[PDB]
Amino acid sequence: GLEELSGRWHSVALASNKSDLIKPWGHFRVFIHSMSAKDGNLHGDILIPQDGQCEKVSLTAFKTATSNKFDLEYWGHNDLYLAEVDPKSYLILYMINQYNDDTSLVAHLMVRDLSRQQDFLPAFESVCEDIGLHKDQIVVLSDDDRCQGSRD
Ligand SMILES: CC(C)=CCC[C@@H](C)CCO
Numbered sequence: 001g002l003e004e005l006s007g008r009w010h011s012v013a014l015a016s017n018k019s020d021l022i023k024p025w026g027h028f029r030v031f032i033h034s035m036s037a038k039d040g041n042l043h044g045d046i047l048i049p050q051d052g053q054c055e056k057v058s059l060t061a062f063k064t065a066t067s068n069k070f071d072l073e074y075w076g077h078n079d080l081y082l083a084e085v086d087p088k089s090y091l092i093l094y095m096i097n098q099y100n101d102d103t104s105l106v107a108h109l110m111v112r113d114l115s116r117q118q119d120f121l122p123a124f125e126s127v128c129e130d131i132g133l134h135k136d137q138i139v140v141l142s143d144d145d146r147c148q149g150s151r152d
């Protein structure tokens, strides 16, 4: 179950229909570090880049009545969906974000093994297509080494 998502993950790519959300300074330009399951809720420590420094924040995505849908408060309300996952290799999620009368779609790919990140970018591109994003709305994070001290 959810507990198999526990442990170390590495962010590979983001996508959004609102480019500002995933720009280098954007609300959802954050790096996953680790996840854990507690009470069937999904807990996650993320790393937030901030002017050469980096903040570690613990978030909880709360289970809902819908399988694989979670409530996450982060820059507004998010309906967080676990779209595709192999707990031992990769995880694709997307969120419907409600913030200040704006509604946006944000997707996120993470992997267990960064040397394999190329293996799963196509699966991410396909999920993005299915939720209506195009390939030019994807940002690959391989040039963004901020928070490198915390991302080991
Ligand atoms: C709460 C959790 C396990 C993960 C949050 C992931 C989003 C904040 C990713 C954003 O791009």
Ligand SMILES: [Mg+2]
Residues within 6 Å of the ligand: 142, 143, 145
């Ligand atoms: Mg590098």
